Design a protein around this ligand. Structure first.
Ligand code: PCG
Ligand code: PCG
Lengths: 127, 127
């Protein structure tokens, strides 16, 4: 009669970081505040070690990430585009380019992230 | 005193094409049926010729479309992402993400579409 989204409990400071990361993101700054709240409770945590490759350009890609701790470097076709520290969203562009990753993301140090899948996202967007 | 949504009369064949098109859409799959029916009745027909530009990335989005006949070609910042045939919904991103058109959409052949405007569309998602 309607499918249940999963809830992942977080520290207040974490929920704040996420909200701010979305509001700082060009594609998503305008979402409902009620929608953002829901996204925050759905994001689950994932950790990567340094010289780990999170996203490979060209790949198919659902997941969207917010960085909590650490630092990554974004490269396309060989070129550094930038680095990203906590408070930044990445992985959003896949959907806008036909679910294909548009750049590769490598970890420069250990990182702690939050993630959310295509599917959760879509249910939310219809509320 | 509540607002009256418009009604555009349609061939049962067309009412089904639309319904299917909605269910095929990642986001709209999610709607209750009562609502998918309301949306079907608020769609109005529009045609474009070969080599027409329906949607321009960056512009403001007010309508959402379903294709009935024809083939259309999606592009972003100058790169063929995909093509779309009958039965497929489009122009739903800008509305849901409350952003500016995320891709350009050009016709490859003469097309016949149905359109619902932001107004009716949102009004419907609220019951
Ligand atoms: N393509 C691109 N991606 C970037 C840039 N800066 C940060 N990113 C992030 O890198 C991500 C790579 O995967 P996505 O395309 O899913 O989403 C992309 C963005 O979130 C940039 O300058 N170009
Ligand atoms: N940005 C983008 N839009 C697409 C793609 N494939 C289909 N579309 C549709 O094209 C529409 C362009 O305008 P919208 O951003 O409103 O909504 C978009 C989607 O419905 C794609 O790969 N990228």
């Amino acid at each position: 009669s309607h499918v249940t989204l999963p809830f992942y409990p977080k520290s207040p400071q974490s929920k704040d970081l996420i909200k701010e990361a979305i509001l700082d993101n060009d594609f998503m700054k305008n979402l409902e505040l009620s929608q953002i709240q829901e996204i925050v409770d759905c994001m689950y945590p994932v950790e990567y070690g340094k010289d780990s490759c999170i996203i490979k350009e060209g790949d198919v890609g659902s997941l969207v990430y917010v960085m909590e701790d650490g630092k990554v470097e974004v490269t396309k076709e060989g070129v550094k585009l930038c680095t990203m520290g906590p408070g930044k969203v990445f992985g959003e562009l896949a959907i806008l380019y036909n679910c294909t990753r548009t750049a590769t993301v490598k970890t420069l140090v250990n990182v702690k992230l939050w993630a959310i899948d295509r599917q959760c996202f879509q249910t939310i967007m219809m509320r």
